[PDB]
Design a protein around this ligand. Structure first.
Ligand SMILES: Cn1c(=O)n(C)c2cc(C(N)=O)ccc21
Length: 126
C-alpha cells in the first residue's frame, strides 16, 4: 500500500500569490520539470509498482514535483520558504532512501544543482 499523497488543497490554509512564488513556478519548477532526469520526481513514489515495500517505512515526509506543481498552480503556499522546503524535502528523501551512487541519486543531484542556481537568484519581494 501507498500512503495518501501530501495535501495540495486546503481551503482553511491562508494563501498568497507573490512574485517570489511566481518565480518558483515559472523559473524553478518549470526548469526542473523539463529536465531529462525529472521523470522519477514528477509524481509521488509508487512503492507498490516500484516494489519498494520499505520506502514509506523510511520516508515519513514524502514530497515530489507533482505535488509541488499542484501546490504552486493552486496557490497553496503563503511564502517561498514553504515551497523551497518542499524541494529540499524531495531531494533529501532521495538521498536518505537510496544507496550512495545510484542512478536516482545522480538524477536528484543534477536537478538540485539547477534548483540551487535558480534559488540563488530568487527575486526580492515586491
Ligand atoms: C528509489 N526511487 C526514489 O527514491 N524515487 C524518487 C524513485 C522514483 C522512481 C520512478 N520510476 O518514478 C523509481 C524509483 C525511485
Amino acid at each position: 500500500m501507498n500512503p495518501p499523497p501530501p495535501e495540495t488543497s486546503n481551503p482553511n490554509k491562508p494563501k498568497r500569490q507573490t512574485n517570489q512564488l511566481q518565480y518558483l513556478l515559472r523559473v524553478v519548477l518549470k526548469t526542473l520539470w523539463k529536465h531529462q532526469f525529472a521523470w522519477p520526481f514528477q509524481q509521488p513514489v509508487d512503492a507498490v509498482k516500484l516494489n519498494l515495500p520499505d520506502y514509506y517505512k523510511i520516508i515519513k515526509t514524502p514530497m515530489d514535483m507533482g505535488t509541488i506543481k499542484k501546490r504552486l498552480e493552486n496557490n497553496y503556499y503563503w511564502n517561498a520558504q514553504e515551497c523551497i522546503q518542499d524541494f529540499n524535502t524531495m531531494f533529501t528523501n532521495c538521498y536518505i532512501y537510496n544507496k550512495p551512487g545510484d542512478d536516482i541519486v545522480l538524477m536528484a543531484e543534477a536537478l538540485e544543482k539547477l534548483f540551487l542556481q535558480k534559488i540563488n537568484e530568487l527575486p526580492t519581494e515586491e
